[PDB]
RNA sequence: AGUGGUAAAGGAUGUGGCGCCGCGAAGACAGCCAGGAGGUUGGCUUAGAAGCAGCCAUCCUUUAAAGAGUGCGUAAUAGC
């Protein structure tokens, strides 16, 4: 029993079809039970979605050894991605919350109890020693303890474990536990990557893809400079040509990723952008690829 | 060894959280929960600034005893200062009786800086602005 | 413009209050533990601007409008100015004599002192820690005006 | 950091550095590379 | 400054000049020494404000004369 969990689900998307002859259900199935058996480390749990799947690793790098050899094997799948559940029920949360501290080594006390105190981390008490350490037990719920074991391995490197579970099924409270800062840029619409349409909105933060990239809609391809999201396009790139006449001038360049990792890449998501893999690329969509979709389930209060 | 630290607590509760407390309880100290020994002390002192006020033996121990109310608090802690419960002010319950700030200290006035035969009128006159009795 | 009507006008008032002042390089103490020697004032002493650490030329020069004999004792490095004009001086001055002297390495050095109205000397003003009650002056008189008789005894 | 112009100093406490006709603002903080001759 | 030997917007502890402000020799400012004082200890937030976390506080005693604390900051706090 390590920790982590990675909703699995199917690329149920419209891009066919497509990485190999195992996307389904069925295909994937089989290799989940296939793993139960080597695999000591691992713990794989049925969620909601008969497209998902709660993968219980190990360490966060774990997870990422069975994902990058589930692509060499030919199957795309998305990550994580099992979230929770609301309950229950009338209601706001009643999921539980469990902190451990991890010494320290007063050289992270300020560093971990930031994260913690900026995510309602709220320190149930912080056990403290004459040796130099000091445990932190912050009762943290799943919504803001994934991703955190990752981000957690950089501030105390490494020397630093505290897991969790649940106290009391909540209500989530009224913050959002993340959601994560810099929006995410998402396309609108199947088609490629075109110079004349990436150079435009181009200083607005960073790009994903490239040209001619051909993606689809909800398919993320960079991020925003703020925190907003939003949805251009562009092919188109636009327009040709001549004549008249010429000859000056200007030629755009563009630069290129930014790209990887994976590994660098799902931790970017945070609400519902499973990071649809396959045996030869990785990409990243919105759990709602239209645009006018995504606002159908948000829809806020009250 | 030895050497201990300063700290100030609070004057009635005894629960010993964050304040007794990460501090003590790690730069030098002994157990914790020095809250059950807050309340049986702290119970007879509290609501003025009362610093005693947090270290750590070789127990550690423990509650009893204490200091009481620091300065302007223990002059005007006799008004109520029930405000602040929005913004910086600013409206119901904010005078004390112009009396009652020199009967609350009056005794409320041995223990400070060299010496002082009146708490009451200069020392209220500081404090009191402090909390919004100007 | 600027220093003679302000300040100037009240270090010798507060200063004048009688005859009976010294002077004590005070400073080298802490807030706190400078917050005590002088605070405490009050109890050894009373109020008495035993030098409430004025600074220079215009204490030592303000002896001229006074003309409190110039307490031409010691003007230079630090100058509280033991003002034990303006509370009781007299045999107070032990209480701030340990007081000072017994914690840390020399508290604080004392300076110049007027005897009422003479000049108190430097090595003349430590060893008076305590203030003689004018017993001394009377020590060796009644006891010393009728002692023909003790070796009379 | 330069511009032909511009430069009035930044760093809440950055430096107004005659240097070569060179108007050259200097600071505690990189981000005040004043370079304006 | 080589302006002489073309240029504006506009920028500036340029150069020199006013006609003016600080001089408490109650001997100045940058340079110096030490203390950087006790009520200053919630108001919310107190996981922390107990000036150096956000919505204002504008008082007192007290002396180096007094910071309703301009500032390096985290967990308050502790240090400059």
Request: hydrophobic share 40%; aromatic share 6%.
């Amino acid at each position: 029993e390590p920790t982590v969990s990675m909703f699995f689900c199917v690329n149920t998307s419209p891009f066919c079809g497509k990485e190999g002859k195992f996307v389904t259900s069925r295909q994937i199935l089989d290799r989940l039970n296939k793993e139960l058996v080597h695999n000591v480390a691992l713990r794989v749990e049925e969620t909601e979605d008969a497209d998902a799947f709660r993968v219980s690793g190990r360490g966060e790098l774990h997870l990422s050894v069975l994902i990058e050899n589930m692509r060499r094997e030919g199957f795309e799948l998305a990550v994580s991605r099992p979230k929770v559940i609301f309950r229950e029920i009338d209601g706001r949360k009643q999921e539980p919350y469990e902190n451990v501290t991890l010494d320290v080594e007063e050289q992270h006390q300020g560093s971990v109890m930031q994260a913690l105190g900026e995510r309602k981390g709220d320190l149930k008490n912080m056990n403290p020693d004459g040796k130099g350490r000091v445990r932190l037990d912050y009762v943290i719920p799943s919504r803001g303890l994934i991703g955190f074991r990752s981000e957690f391995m950089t501030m105390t490197s490494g020397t630093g474990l505290l897991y969790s579970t649940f106290s009391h099924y909540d209500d989530v409270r009224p913050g959002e536990v993340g959601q994560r800062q810099n929006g995410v840029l998402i396309s609108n619409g199947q088609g490629k990557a075109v110079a004349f349409a990436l150079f435009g909105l181009q200083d607005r933060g960073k790009l994903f893809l490239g040209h001619g990239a051909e993606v689809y809609e909800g398919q993320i391809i960079g991020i925003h400079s703020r925190s907003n999201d939003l949805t251009v396009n562009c092919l188109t790139g636009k327009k040709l040509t001549n004549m008249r006449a010429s000859g000056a001038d200007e030629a755009v360049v563009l630069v290129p990723p930014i790209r990887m990792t994976l590994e660098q890449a799902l931790e970017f998501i945070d609400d519902d952008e499973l990071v649809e893999v396959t045996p030869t690329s990785i990409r990243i969509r919105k759990r709602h690829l239209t645009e006018n979709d995504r606002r159908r389930a948000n829809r806020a209060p009250k | 060894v030895v050497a201990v630290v300063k700290l100030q607590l609070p004057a009635g509760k005894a629960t010993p959280a964050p304040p007794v407390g990460p501090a003590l309880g790690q730069h030098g100290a002994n157990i914790m929960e020095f809250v059950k020994a807050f309340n049986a002390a702290t119970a007879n002192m509290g609501d003025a600034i009362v610093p005693v006020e947090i270290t750590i033996y070789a127990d550690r121990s423990f509650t009893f005893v204490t200091k009481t109310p620091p300065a302007s608090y223990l002059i005007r802690k006799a008004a109520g200062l029930e405000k602040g419960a929005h913004k910086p002010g600013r409206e119901k319950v904010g005078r004390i009786t112009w009396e009652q700030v020199l009967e609350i200290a009056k005794q409320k006035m041995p223990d400070l800086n060299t010496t002082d035969l009146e708490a009451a009128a200069r020392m209220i006159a500081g404090s009191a602005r402090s909390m919004g009795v100007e | 413009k600027r220093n003679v009507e302000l300040l100037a006008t009240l270090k010798e008032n507060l200063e004048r209050a009688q005859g009976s002042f010294f002077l004590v390089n005070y400073q080298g103490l802490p807030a706190k533990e400078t917050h005590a020697l002088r605070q405490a004032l009050k109890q050894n002493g009373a109020r008495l601007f035993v030098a409430k650490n004025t600074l220079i030329r215009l204490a030592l020069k303000e002896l001229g409008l006074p003309e409190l004999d110039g307490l031409q004792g010691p003007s230079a490095v630090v100058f509280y100015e033991d003002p034990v004009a303006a509370a009781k001086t007299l045999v107070q001055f032990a209480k701030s004599n340990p007081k000072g002297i017994p914690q840390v390495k020399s508290g604080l050095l004392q300076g110049q002192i007027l005897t009422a109205k003479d000049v108190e000397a430097l090595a003349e003003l430590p060893t008076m820690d305590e203030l003689r009650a004018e017993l001394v002056g009377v020590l060796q008189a009644p006891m010393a005006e009728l002692v023909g008789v003790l070796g009379g005894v | 950091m330069k511009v032909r112009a511009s430069v009035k100093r930044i760093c809440d406490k950055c430096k107004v550095i005659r240097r070569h006709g060179r108007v050259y603002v200097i600071c505690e903080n990189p981000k005040h590379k004043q370079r304006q001759g």
